[PDB]
């Protein structure tokens, strides 16, 4: 029962070796392995379309039967490396093949990863949520039998079972040096939260990483991994075995349609100056007033541009706004607008996400008693937006943890013997009612809620809205409210209300969402004129600081710079403008001065 020859494997290995034999051709893969040898790694990367071009049949054979074809491929790779250099091949017991390129049907998402893809290559794109600790997995254990003076081996691979006795019950001692071990980490991927329906459920897919692939991933990373989707031994559980991992850019881009780009460019070139004000009016038209707040919310969505210095600095471009006001004010309604409006947002309560909370947390599995580093709500909002309601009700641990992300944009955790430093750069829109309602304009904003004044320093902007009993103002709001009440769709007969379905001038939210996404790609830079202008404005504000919100400081200066940068995005200007700084200056003056 000993297999002698596999002609299919023989030919398939030769076909790869011919493909790897890149000397008659441009040398791209021959150079890659040469660079790989210089790199001293043992995992070549491969574009599938090259294989398709050189042999469509072989590439189809590979994708339809990932396992055996890769084994032939790794055979060819090791042989090819040994051809170029035997001793370097002898350094490593094996080599590995990383796939890359286009996959028509096999490029899917965890939502769309069907069971049909079992045993096929698949390029799953998604977001990391959970990561396990790095552990050394034993694959091949060498044992020695002094009684027989005999060496025995065993391979586990996909296959209590750890042998310790000879068949004659001689003791066996494990040659730890000769035995083969490899670091091995497990992570979980989910669909990108922006592009996922609320009706459906999560589709979490488990990924296995080995060797160099182990720590090329962290929780809250947007990645695509190519691997072999497989079942597990026993109704069965299914996991993906990674063949190559890459962290795609989290910014991505607004592809959409060129029609959207043309409409955006047409609208932008229509009135570039009024686009900021027009968007603000159409940002939250269901709520009358708070127009400066709407301007700031727009600034938050567009945000600034991060500056990183020679000293490893990461001077943030994000903007953080806090809103305080008595209950029964549209604060909650504002957040619903932002969630519907923002390109990449995520809501959360004062409690935070269940268990994990705002930032990440370490959770044992409790199914096998296994530690897992779970990303929190804040981490998933990286390079996005987070909306926090009942921000006053934040827990004390979270009240401390918010400091790091607000300052550095990165959360760290060394607890439970588990070491991680995750990215959480996220412009945050927080809101909190005053305690006992009934805000008083005599105490600090902190004293009405309690924030320690570190958070208030951290927040770029703070806006206070009060339930003033002005009959004129209340008439304006109430008349607006009743106008929304009286409003009926053009197609309707004033009769029945909308059906109870199971599913869930003024510009559209979607088009606005498209435009801000396009604007977010824009990278407005500074102008010497505006830089001079704002510097005078800041020093003027320092002069205004003589009068006795927080005093103006260098925090406020950088807040203005991001605000002008955000307005620079709003008009799509490739540089900031005096209009941008001027709009920011009046906005800040409105915030600190009523």
């Amino acid at each position: 029962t000993v297999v002698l020859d596999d002609v299919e494997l023989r030919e398939a290995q030769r076909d790869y070796l011919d493909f790897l034999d890149d000397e008659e051709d441009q040398g791209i893969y021959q150079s890659k392995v040469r660079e790989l040898i210089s790199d001293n790694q043992y995992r070549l990367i491969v574009n599938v379309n090259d294989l398709r071009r050189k042999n469509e049949k072989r590439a189809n054979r590979l994708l339809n039967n990932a396992f055996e074809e890769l084994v032939a491929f790794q055979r060819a790779l090791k042989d090819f490396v040994a051809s170029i250099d035997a001793t370097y091949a002898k350094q490593y017991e094996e080599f590995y093949v990383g796939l890359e390129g286009s996959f028509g049907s096999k490029h899917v998402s965890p939502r769309t990863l069907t069971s049909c893809f079992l045993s096929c290559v698949v390029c799953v794109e998604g977001i990391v949520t959970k990561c396990s600790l790095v552990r050394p997995k034993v694959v091949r254990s060498v044992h020695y039998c002094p009684a027989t003076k005999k060496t025995i081996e065993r391979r586990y691979s996909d296959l209590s079972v750890y042998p310790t006795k000879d068949e004659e019950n001689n003791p066996l001692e494990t040659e730890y040096g000769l035995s083969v071990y490899k670091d091995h980490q497990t992570i979980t991927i989910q669909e990108m939260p922006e592009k996922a329906p609320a009706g459906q459920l999560p589709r979490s897919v488990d990924v296995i990483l080995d060797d160099d692939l182990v720590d090329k991933a962290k929780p809250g990373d947007r990645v695509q991994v190519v691997g072999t989707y497989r079942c597990l031994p026993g109704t069965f559980r299914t996991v993906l075995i990674a063949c190559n991992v890459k962290q795609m850019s989290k910014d991505a881009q607004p592809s959409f349609s060129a029609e959207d780009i043309a409409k955006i460019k047409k609208f932008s070139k229509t009135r570039s100056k009024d686009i900021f004000d027009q968007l603000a009016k159409s940002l939250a038209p269901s709520i009358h007033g708070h127009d400066y707040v709407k301007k700031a919310i727009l600034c938050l969505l567009l945000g600034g541009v991060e500056r990183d210095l020679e000293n490893g600095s990461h001077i943030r471009g994000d903007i953080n706004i806090l809103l305080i006001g008595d209950p029964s004010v549209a604060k909650s309604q504002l957040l619903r607008y932002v969630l519907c409006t923002a390109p990449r947002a995520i809501p959360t309560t004062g409690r935070g996400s269940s268990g994990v909370g705002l930032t990440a947390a370490v959770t044992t599995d409790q199914e096998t008693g296994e530690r897992r580093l779970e990303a929190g709500a804040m981490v998933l909002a990286d390079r996005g937006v987070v909306c926090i309601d009942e921000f006053d009700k934040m827990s004390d641990m979270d009240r401390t943890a918010i400091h790091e992300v607000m300052e550095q944009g990165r959360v760290t955790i060394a607890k439970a013997g588990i070491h991680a430093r995750l990215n959480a750069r996220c412009s945050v829109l927080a809101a909190a009612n005053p305690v006992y309602g009934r805000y008083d304009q005599y105490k600090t904003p902190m004293e009405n809620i309690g924030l320690q004044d570190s958070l208030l320093s951290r927040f770029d902007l703070l806006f206070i809205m009060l339930d003033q009993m002005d009959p004129e103002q209340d008439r304006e709001i109430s008349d607006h409210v009743l106008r929304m009440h009286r409003y009926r769709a053009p197609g309707e007969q004033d009769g029945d209300a909308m059906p109870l379905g199971s599913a869930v001038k003024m510009v559209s939210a979607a088009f606005m969402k498209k435009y801000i996404h396009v604007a977010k790609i824009i990278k407005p830079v500074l102008t010497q004129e505006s830089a001079t202008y704002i510097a005078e404005e800041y020093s003027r504000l320092r002069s205004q600081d003589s009068m006795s919100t927080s005093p103006v400081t260098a925090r406020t200066l950088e807040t203005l710079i991001r605000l002008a940068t955000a307005h620079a995005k709003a008009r799509m200007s490739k540089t900031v403008d005096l209009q941008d700084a001027e709009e920011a200056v009046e906005l800040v003056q409105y915030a600190y001065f009523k």
Partner: protein, 39 residues
């Protein structure tokens, strides 16, 4: 063919997605003062 015990070979085991749900009688369809049935 060891007798009954066998080893599964998941490589060739073909599987499909799988989901269990619970359905209940609509609130109108239940009798008065009766528990809706579940399937």
């Amino acid at each position: 063919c060891p007798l009954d015990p066998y080893f599964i070979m998941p490589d060739k085991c073909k599987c499909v997605d799988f989901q269990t749900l619970k359905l209940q009688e609509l609130p109108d369809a239940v009798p008065h003062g009766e528990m809706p049935r579940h399937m």
